[PDB]
Structure formats: C-alpha cells, structure tokens
Design an enzyme around this catalytic site. Structure first.
Site, PDB file in Angstrom:
ATOM      1  N   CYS A  46       5.227  14.372  -1.830  1.00  0.00           N
ATOM      2  CA  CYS A  46       4.018  13.687  -2.360  1.00  0.00           C
ATOM      3  C   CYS A  46       4.352  12.211  -2.445  1.00  0.00           C
ATOM      4  O   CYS A  46       5.514  11.779  -2.645  1.00  0.00           O
ATOM      5  CB  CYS A  46       3.663  14.375  -3.682  1.00  0.00           C
ATOM      6  SG  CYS A  46       2.493  13.529  -4.858  1.00  0.00           S
ATOM      7  N   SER A  48       3.896  10.327  -4.860  1.00  0.00           N
ATOM      8  CA  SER A  48       4.530  10.004  -6.147  1.00  0.00           C
ATOM      9  C   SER A  48       6.067  10.124  -6.080  1.00  0.00           C
ATOM     10  O   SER A  48       6.774   9.424  -6.790  1.00  0.00           O
ATOM     11  CB  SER A  48       4.061  10.896  -7.272  1.00  0.00           C
ATOM     12  OG  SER A  48       2.633  10.709  -7.442  1.00  0.00           O
ATOM     13  N   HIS A  51       7.035   6.934  -4.754  1.00  0.00           N
ATOM     14  CA  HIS A  51       6.928   5.949  -5.816  1.00  0.00           C
ATOM     15  C   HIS A  51       8.183   5.865  -6.701  1.00  0.00           C
ATOM     16  O   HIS A  51       8.505   4.802  -7.213  1.00  0.00           O
ATOM     17  CB  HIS A  51       5.723   6.228  -6.742  1.00  0.00           C
ATOM     18  CG  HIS A  51       4.400   5.937  -6.091  1.00  0.00           C
ATOM     19  ND1 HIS A  51       4.149   5.147  -5.009  1.00  0.00           N
ATOM     20  CD2 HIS A  51       3.188   6.439  -6.526  1.00  0.00           C
ATOM     21  CE1 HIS A  51       2.826   5.130  -4.762  1.00  0.00           C
ATOM     22  NE2 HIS A  51       2.275   5.903  -5.656  1.00  0.00           N
ATOM     23  N   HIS A  67       8.329  17.390  -7.208  1.00  0.00           N
ATOM     24  CA  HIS A  67       7.485  18.010  -8.205  1.00  0.00           C
ATOM     25  C   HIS A  67       6.356  18.932  -7.675  1.00  0.00           C
ATOM     26  O   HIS A  67       5.755  19.613  -8.519  1.00  0.00           O
ATOM     27  CB  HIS A  67       6.800  16.923  -9.119  1.00  0.00           C
ATOM     28  CG  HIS A  67       5.978  16.024  -8.231  1.00  0.00           C
ATOM     29  ND1 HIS A  67       6.481  15.094  -7.369  1.00  0.00           N
ATOM     30  CD2 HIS A  67       4.611  15.978  -8.068  1.00  0.00           C
ATOM     31  CE1 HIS A  67       5.523  14.472  -6.697  1.00  0.00           C
ATOM     32  NE2 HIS A  67       4.405  15.023  -7.136  1.00  0.00           N
ATOM     33  N   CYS A 174       0.798  20.256  -6.644  1.00  0.00           N
ATOM     34  CA  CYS A 174       0.370  18.874  -6.947  1.00  0.00           C
ATOM     35  C   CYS A 174      -0.830  18.446  -6.121  1.00  0.00           C
ATOM     36  O   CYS A 174      -1.916  18.375  -6.745  1.00  0.00           O
ATOM     37  CB  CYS A 174       1.504  17.861  -6.650  1.00  0.00           C
ATOM     38  SG  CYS A 174       0.853  16.185  -7.164  1.00  0.00           S
TER      39      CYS A 174
HETATM   40  N1  LIG Z   1      -3.135  11.593 -10.650  1.00  0.00           N
HETATM   41  C1  LIG Z   1      -2.258  12.644 -10.275  1.00  0.00           C
HETATM   42  O1  LIG Z   1      -2.088  13.620 -10.988  1.00  0.00           O
HETATM   43  C2  LIG Z   1      -1.671  12.417  -8.895  1.00  0.00           C
HETATM   44  C3  LIG Z   1      -1.194  13.594  -8.188  1.00  0.00           C
HETATM   45  C4  LIG Z   1      -0.748  13.290  -6.904  1.00  0.00           C
HETATM   46  C5  LIG Z   1      -0.710  12.085  -6.352  1.00  0.00           C
HETATM   47  N2  LIG Z   1      -1.158  10.987  -7.132  1.00  0.00           N
HETATM   48  C6  LIG Z   1      -1.134   9.640  -6.466  1.00  0.00           C
HETATM   49  O2  LIG Z   1      -2.302   9.541  -5.566  1.00  0.00           O
HETATM   50  C7  LIG Z   1      -2.065   8.575  -4.455  1.00  0.00           C
HETATM   51  C8  LIG Z   1      -2.278   9.278  -3.151  1.00  0.00           C
HETATM   52  O3  LIG Z   1      -1.212  10.304  -3.027  1.00  0.00           O
HETATM   53  P1  LIG Z   1      -1.022  10.786  -1.498  1.00  0.00           P
HETATM   54  O4  LIG Z   1       0.114  11.731  -1.583  1.00  0.00           O
HETATM   55  O5  LIG Z   1      -2.329  11.319  -0.999  1.00  0.00           O
HETATM   56  O6  LIG Z   1      -0.628   9.535  -0.657  1.00  0.00           O
HETATM   57  P2  LIG Z   1      -0.600   8.951   0.774  1.00  0.00           P
HETATM   58  O7  LIG Z   1       0.305   7.808   0.871  1.00  0.00           O
HETATM   59  O8  LIG Z   1      -0.486  10.130   1.738  1.00  0.00           O
HETATM   60  O9  LIG Z   1      -2.130   8.496   1.044  1.00  0.00           O
HETATM   61  C9  LIG Z   1      -2.679   7.228   0.537  1.00  0.00           C
HETATM   62  C10 LIG Z   1      -3.667   6.774   1.591  1.00  0.00           C
HETATM   63  O10 LIG Z   1      -4.069   5.403   1.153  1.00  0.00           O
HETATM   64  C11 LIG Z   1      -4.323   4.684   2.328  1.00  0.00           C
HETATM   65  N3  LIG Z   1      -4.268   3.301   1.933  1.00  0.00           N
HETATM   66  C12 LIG Z   1      -3.287   2.405   1.636  1.00  0.00           C
HETATM   67  N4  LIG Z   1      -3.688   1.182   1.322  1.00  0.00           N
HETATM   68  C13 LIG Z   1      -5.027   1.218   1.402  1.00  0.00           C
HETATM   69  C14 LIG Z   1      -6.048   0.166   1.158  1.00  0.00           C
HETATM   70  N5  LIG Z   1      -5.771  -1.056   0.789  1.00  0.00           N
HETATM   71  N6  LIG Z   1      -7.289   0.652   1.335  1.00  0.00           N
HETATM   72  C15 LIG Z   1      -7.692   1.860   1.703  1.00  0.00           C
HETATM   73  N7  LIG Z   1      -6.768   2.893   1.962  1.00  0.00           N
HETATM   74  C16 LIG Z   1      -5.446   2.512   1.767  1.00  0.00           C
HETATM   75  C17 LIG Z   1      -3.152   5.012   3.307  1.00  0.00           C
HETATM   76  O11 LIG Z   1      -3.374   4.596   4.564  1.00  0.00           O
HETATM   77  C18 LIG Z   1      -3.019   6.468   2.994  1.00  0.00           C
HETATM   78  O12 LIG Z   1      -3.703   7.332   4.023  1.00  0.00           O
HETATM   79  C19 LIG Z   1      -0.611   8.081  -4.759  1.00  0.00           C
HETATM   80  O13 LIG Z   1      -0.660   6.836  -5.488  1.00  0.00           O
HETATM   81  C20 LIG Z   1       0.087   9.162  -5.600  1.00  0.00           C
HETATM   82  O14 LIG Z   1       1.103   8.687  -6.443  1.00  0.00           O
HETATM   83  C21 LIG Z   1      -1.669  11.176  -8.380  1.00  0.00           C
HETATM   84  C1  LIG Z   2       2.623   7.331 -14.023  1.00  0.00           C
HETATM   85  C2  LIG Z   2       1.850   8.668 -13.742  1.00  0.00           C
HETATM   86  C3  LIG Z   2       2.533   9.429 -12.556  1.00  0.00           C
HETATM   87  C4  LIG Z   2       1.700  10.702 -12.236  1.00  0.00           C
HETATM   88  C5  LIG Z   2       2.242  11.415 -10.958  1.00  0.00           C
HETATM   89  C6  LIG Z   2       3.478  12.264 -11.399  1.00  0.00           C
HETATM   90  C7  LIG Z   2       3.809  13.173 -10.164  1.00  0.00           C
HETATM   91  S1  LIG Z   2       2.188  13.743  -9.569  1.00  0.00           S
HETATM   92  O1  LIG Z   2       2.098  13.171  -8.241  1.00  0.00           O
HETATM   93  C8  LIG Z   2       1.197  12.542 -10.557  1.00  0.00           C
HETATM   94 ZN   LIG Z   3       2.374  14.630  -6.585  1.00  0.00          ZN
END
Ligand SMILES: NC(=O)c1ccc[n+]([C@@H]2O[C@H](COP(=O)([O-])OP(=O)(O)OC[C@H]3O[C@@H](n4cnc5c(N)ncnc54)[C@H](O)[C@@H]3O)[C@@H](O)[C@H]2O)c1
Ligand SMILES: CCCC[C@H]1CC[S@](=O)C1
Ligand SMILES: [Zn+2]
Ligand SMILES: NC(=O)c1ccc[n+]([C@@H]2O[C@H](COP(=O)([O-])OP(=O)(O)OC[C@H]3O[C@@H](n4cnc5c(N)ncnc54)[C@H](O)[C@@H]3O)[C@@H](O)[C@H]2O)c1
Ligand SMILES: CCCC[C@H]1CC[S@](=O)C1
Ligand SMILES: [Zn+2]
Ligand SMILES: [Zn+2]
Ligand SMILES: [Zn+2]
Lengths: 374, 374
Positions: A46, A48, A51, A67, A174
C-alpha cells in the site's frame, strides 16, 4: 511444532528512512496472553507503507512495516478466544477493542487502542515481539506484515472464512475496504449522484467500485497519470480527466462538467493542495468531500472557511469507516459470494523476497497492487 | 394609495466603512414585475450587519443594510402570486427560487439566486430601487431592512401568520432560525449528546435552544464575556467556560471536560482560530463541528487534515440550512404554537431612528438582540 518457541524467520526490516528494505533474519517471540502469532501468506504493498519509507507517515524506526495482509494462525497466547491455530486471519491496522467509547458508538471506528495517532510501534503492552541483530524492532500499527511471522494483539485480528483465497483477500486488510467504505459508508453516496475521485491507485479504484455499487450515475476519475484511466473505466469511472491537459484549475473544470459541482468528491492521493481542490469541486450548498489520502506529517493546509459556510460537508476516515473486526469477516464473506471484485486491483504478484522491486513498481507508476507471497 | 408611486421615506445609509449609519431621506421606487414593496415593522440588529460596517463582510457601498426583519406588504409588482398587500411578511436574505439545482435538492438551501457569494448589492435585475439625493444606493442581500420601506424580489419574501407579533418574529428572519437550524438540521444533534457552543450572542443562544430541543444532555457554552453566561444557562447551557480564565488552550479543557471530545461543536463567533478550536474539540472519530460565524473577508484558516482523517465531520451553513421560503412560515407557526421562545434573545427595543445606539449596545457587549421598531 513452533508453538511456545522463538521463531527465526525472514522479515523486511526498514532501518532508516529513504532506504531499501533489508531482508534479514529476525526473531519472533511467542505470543503472550491475548496475543496471536500469524504465519503470513500474502501481503500487499500500500502507498502508506511507502509513506513510512519516505518519512511522509512517521512511525518509530527501525520497523517491520506492512499492514495489508492475510495469514494463518500459528499459535495463540493464553486467554485468546476469537481465533484458533489453523484459522485464516487478516490483521487489523485499526483495532476493535469493543469496549471504548468509539467502539461503542454507532458510527465510530477509530478505536482508542489504535497505534496511529501517537505511534509507539509496540504491542498493546508497550513491548516488541521482534528482535534483529540483537536489537528490538518496532511494530507498525499493531500489524507488521512484512515478515514471514508476526504477532498481533487479539483486538487486531479477525478470523475469516476457512476457504478464502488469501492472495486476494489480503486487500480487504486495507486498500479495498478503505476505498469501498469511504464511498458507501463515509460519504454515503446516493443513487443517481455525480462523484469525483482524485487518485486512481488501488484505493481510488476501490472508491470507484463503491460509488458504482451505490448507484452513482457519473464517476469522474482524476489523475495526472493517464495510464491509470483504462482500469478506472473498467471498474466504473464514466469519465477520466488529467489536470495537466487543462489550462484552468481542475476544480473549475469539474465544477463545469458537473453543472455546478459534484455531489461527492474524494481525495485519495495525500496532498494538501488536492484536499482543498477536492473540497472546492463538490457543490457549494450540499456537496460532501471525503479525505482518504495521507498527507505529509505535521503539515497544515490553508483554506477559506467560506467553502464550508455555504453548506459543504468535509470529512475524513481511516479504513473506510468500518469497525474493523466486525466488518472484515463480512467483507470476506461478501467477496466469496462475488458481491465485489478484487482482481482489478491486482496488477503484479511477486515473492516476498522481491519486496524492493514491488516498491519500485509502485513508485514508477506502473502498478496498482503488487501482492507479495511468502 | 402609494401603490405604483415613489415613496419618500427615512433609511439608515452606510456611506463608507467604519462610520455610523446616517439617517437619510431616500426615494424608494415602486416594485417592478415580481417585486414586493414592504413597510417595515421591526428589524433586529445582527452581528452580520455590523460586519458590513467593520469591513469583515464586503459588499458594495453605499448601502442600506439590515436583513433580519418583518413587515407588511404595501404593494406588489405585476405577476406576484405569493403575497398580497396587507400580508405580514419576513424578507429572506437567502432566497428560494424553487427552480435551481439547490432548491430542488432535498438538503440544499443556498439558492443560486443569492447575492451572498459575489455580492452585487442590487435587485435580481441588476438595478437599485433606492436613491439618495439622486445617487443610487445599493441593496444588501436582496433585503435591506434598515429602511421604513424596502423592495425585494418575490423569491426573497415569505408570507407569515397574520396574527404574529412582528416585533418578535423578525428574529426568525435570521438569528433564531440560523442558530436553531444549525443545531437541529445541520448538525442533527442527538439525544443525550454533549455539545459545545462558541459564542453566546443571539445566534449562539439559538444554537443552545436547538441543542436543548434535540435532547442534548450537556451543552457547554464558551465566551470571553462572562456576562453572557447567565442567559446562556437560562436557555439550556449546563456549564459555561471563559477561555481567558485558563492557562491552557480551551480545546484541551473541553476535551477533558467531555472525557475525550464533544459530540457536536458550533462556531458562532466568526474567528478563524475558534473555527479550528471548535473542530478540534469534537471527538476525533465521530464528532461533528458546524461553522456558523462569518470570518473576515478573504482570510484563510490553517488546520491539520489529520483532524478530519480520524473521522471528524466539519460543515457550515447559511440560515441554519433551512430552505427559506418554505421554512420561515412554518417557524412562525411553531412560535405561535409555543414550540420555542424568542423573548430570551431580545434585550433592548429602540425606535428605528436610534439605530446607532442599538449598534453601540451590540459593540459594547451589553445586548443580545436590539429590535428596532418603526
Ligand atoms: N485513510 C486510510 O485509511 C487509508 C488507507 C489506505 C491508503 N490511504 C492513503 O491513500 C492514498 C492512496 O493510496 P494508494 O495505495 O491508492 O496509492 P497510489 O500511489 O497507488 O495512488 C495514488 C494515485 O494518485 C495519483 N496522483 C499523484 N499526484 C496527483 C495529483 N497531483 N493529482 C491527481 N492525481 C495524483 C497517482 O498518479 C496515483 O495513481 C495514499 O496517500 C495512502 O497513504 C489511506
Ligand atoms: C497518519 C494516518 C495513516 C493512516 C494509514 C495507516 C496505514 S493504512 O494505509 C491508513
Ligand atoms: Zn494501507
Ligand atoms: N451563517 C449564517 O447564516 C449566520 C446568520 C447569522 C449570524 N451569523 C454570524 O454568526 C456570528 C454570531 O452572530 P451574533 O449576532 O450572535 O453575534 P454576537 O456578536 O452577538 O455574538 C458573538 C459572541 O462571540 C463572543 N466572542 C467574541 N470573540 C470571542 C472569542 N475569541 N472567544 C469566545 N467568544 C468570543 C462575544 O463575546 C459574543 O457574545 C457572527 O459572525 C455573524 O456574522 C451567521
Ligand atoms: C459572507 C457570508 C455572510 C452570511 C451572513 C449574511 C447575513 S446573515 O447574518 C448570514
Ligand atoms: Zn475500542
Ligand atoms: Zn444575520
Ligand atoms: Zn434556487
């Protein structure tokens, strides 16, 4: 066979920021009371976890990250009642203690026993079950799935169907649950509505799936990488726009395309500037915008509160707002009844030892979810 | 007898920022098609009218301000079908055209014909009905109630109960409906919840009334003027806190008082810093915070988006989220049936020509609502 014993096994240890994972031998202690030791079967990469490498998401180092996974219970500590050795399980990076004020609230899922807010990188008791090179190694969100074996607290694991395919259902741990629940539970997307989804990676594609399942009429995918569009249309996007193709800000374009602003908008990237853009593009009087992307640690955004005073609703959530230990086994049940698909999210499958290649695929823009198998 | 003729009357004209209102002889043109000329009976002094004087709220000057009022229709333009001469009416600073995408949405109330977002200070046709010594004087929000007579578009007026007391129900044109609706319709305060209300002026007291009518168990009033506390407790506050009394930030205080964060918080002041404090003090996984106060023009707040990612919901509204032409009459009907009280808001009553004394009373902290009578 290994019950009650220290296990020596391979794990991907992250010793420092901005460095490759180091695949090395680690020692995994046996579970203490109310703890569960899991043999990992599959884990997804993922953003994250990336990150943690870039320093966007701060957690104590050195660490075993990971995770989003699934495995099989190797052994249980005294007092465990909810899983048994041999059960298939999915670690929960958001726990469900069942006792706190959030767990007892009808809409809360950010259990107060989480290790997300003020990360210790430990078990619930404040110690580690991991040693490497003679040093204690932190856990990550009570999960730490980038290891052949991990130990988690009982509130951070769910028992799932005995016949599920763990190389697929690890995404319920996730990415899929987060996106899908962000549309269906958190936004509560309505039939006939117009949605805008910013970020078309695994989680943004899951958001699309949930918007389609909720009966949205139009689902506009937004990404700066136009290679992401084809899959986004396969899982439901009715249109896709790349901000780089337009002379005016994308919130203007989206507002025009939706004849005054979308019903629901989702930031699924992790940028402060898209968080505000996404809020702006939802209709000013009744639009709803959900933050799902994880922004750079400790950094504030700036916005004009008139965006809210006109009537917008802005919200965020972890794990798509699902109470994790109630929801995960039901999600797996639904996947086994083919209520949703997970295959469109999986682009690449690699052995665990090629984890660095898996992170390179994500960082180059090439993959959605690489699944690592043990 | 004045139907179809110019009326010469007194209005309070604000010629430039940060000056007293000026009682002037103005000429009010007769209503054109779909326009309604009203004889004012009572108008309240809202803090948003004071924001025009201070430059917090930008709108073209010179202007006749006033937006919280009631009066009697003196005449109607051709094509008007919703009011007649003699009817009691309340002017609606947020219109309800009934035809736009917002008026048709179930929840939206920020009609697209409003003159709030990009204020022109005119009638819907782009012209003014007001002249002062040959100079056109702008309208404010399509209402302009600080005038013995005003003209309004038909989508900015509602007919109310012929037996209603206009010197009380004018408060339904803004302050009461905004506060009460913010609690009961926008936040949807629940039975047994804990609420925190920042700002204990007329609108904040109305929020407290709405929280108490919704069954909140605890309602914590927050103001830096402790003279506001008695009246807040009279209408439902269970506790009141002054942030100046503490050596720590009030969001911490409220989070401890509420054993980890309130269910619902309201900003009813108009400061960026209290908007972020109010969001922070709601429980991080399920809390809801509503912005009701108007901030200084063009200024952005700074906030950490992690406050939303954990689960909070932040929203704002204009006029309590009530579709104005539909709800104003029903609110008056409910007042007539003793469903809520309006006297607790009214501390002073002055004749109209004492408008500057009424604003002095507001600015010194001594009043809640002064009602100006004609
Ligand atoms: N809130 C939660 O519980 C949770 C769970 C999982 C992931 N997340 C987060 O969600 C985000 C997405 O996760 P992912 O695994 O899908 O990531 P990822 O990197 O696969 O996808 C992100 C997408 O954003 C696009 N992108 C980048 N910059 C951009 C811009 N300026 N404008 C438009 N599109 C843009 C990329 O091209 C990419 O396809 C991450 O920040 C991750 O940490 C949060
Ligand atoms: C600072 C909040 C982080 C949240 C992320 C923890 C792993 S999951 O992809 C969501
Ligand atoms: Zn995740
Ligand atoms: N959203 C809408 O539709 C709408 C409708 C009406 C009023 N408003 C806005 O609502 C706000 C309240 O209006 P009102 O008429 O009740 O005003 P008011 O001035 O009577 O009440 C404001 C209260 O804020 C308190 N206050 C000021 N600074 C404070 C601080 N730093 N901390 C704590 N308390 C503080 C004052 O002592 C006062 O009692 C204003 O900004 C007004 O413009 C918005
Ligand atoms: C710029 C937003 C102003 C909103 C206020 C206009 C009059 S009413 O008091 C609400
Ligand atoms: Zn809990
Ligand atoms: Zn007002
Ligand atoms: Zn309308």
């Amino acid at each position: 066979s290994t019950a009650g014993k220290v296990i020596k096994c391979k794990a991907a240890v992250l010793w420092e920021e901005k460095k490759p994972f180091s695949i090395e031998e680690v020692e995994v202690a046996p579970p203490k009371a109310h703890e569960v030791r899991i043999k990992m079967v599959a884990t997804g990469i993922c953003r994250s976890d990336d990150h943690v490498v870039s320093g966007t998401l701060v957690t104590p180092l050195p660490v075993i990250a990971g995770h989003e996974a699934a495995g099989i219970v190797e052994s249980i500590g005294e007092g465990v009642t909810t899983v048994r050795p041999g059960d298939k399980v999915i670690p929960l990076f958001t726990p469900q203690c069942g006792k706190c004020r959030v767990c007892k609230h009808p809409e809360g899922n950010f259990c107060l026993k989480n290790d997300l807010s003020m990360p210790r990188g430990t078990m619930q008791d404040g110690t580690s079950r991991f040693t490497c090179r003679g040093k204690p190694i932190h856990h990550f969100l009570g999960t730490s799935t980038f290891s052949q074996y991990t130990v988690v607290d009982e509130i951070s694991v769910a028992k799932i169907d005995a016949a599920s395919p763990l190389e697929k259902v690890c995404l319920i741990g996730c990415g899929f649950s987060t996106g899908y629940g962000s549309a269906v539970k958190v936004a509560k997307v309505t039939q006939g509505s117009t949605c805008a989804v910013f970020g078309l990676g695994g989680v943004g594609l899951s958001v699309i799936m949930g918007c389609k399942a909720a009966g949205a009429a139009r689902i506009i995918g937004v990404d700066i990488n136009k290679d992401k569009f084809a899959k986004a249309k396969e899982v439901g996007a009715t249109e896709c726009v790349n901000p780089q193709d337009y002379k005016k800000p994308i919130q203007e374009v989206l507002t025009e395309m939706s004849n005054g602003g979308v019903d629901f908008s989702f930031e699924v990237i992790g940028r402060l500037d898209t968080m505000v853009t996404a809020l702006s593009c939802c209709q000013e009087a009744y639009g709803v915008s959900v933050i799902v992307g994880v922004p750079p640690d400790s950094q504030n955004l700036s916005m004009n509160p008139m965006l809210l005073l006109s009537g917008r609703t802005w919200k965020g959530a972890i794990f798509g707002g699902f109470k994790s230990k109630d929801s995960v086994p039901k999600l797996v049940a639904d996947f086994m009844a083919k209520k949703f698909a997970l295959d469109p999210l999986i682009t690449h499958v690699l052995p665990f030892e090629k984890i660095n290649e898996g992170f390179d695929l994500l960082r180059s823009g090439e993959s959605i979810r690489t699944i690592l198998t043990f």
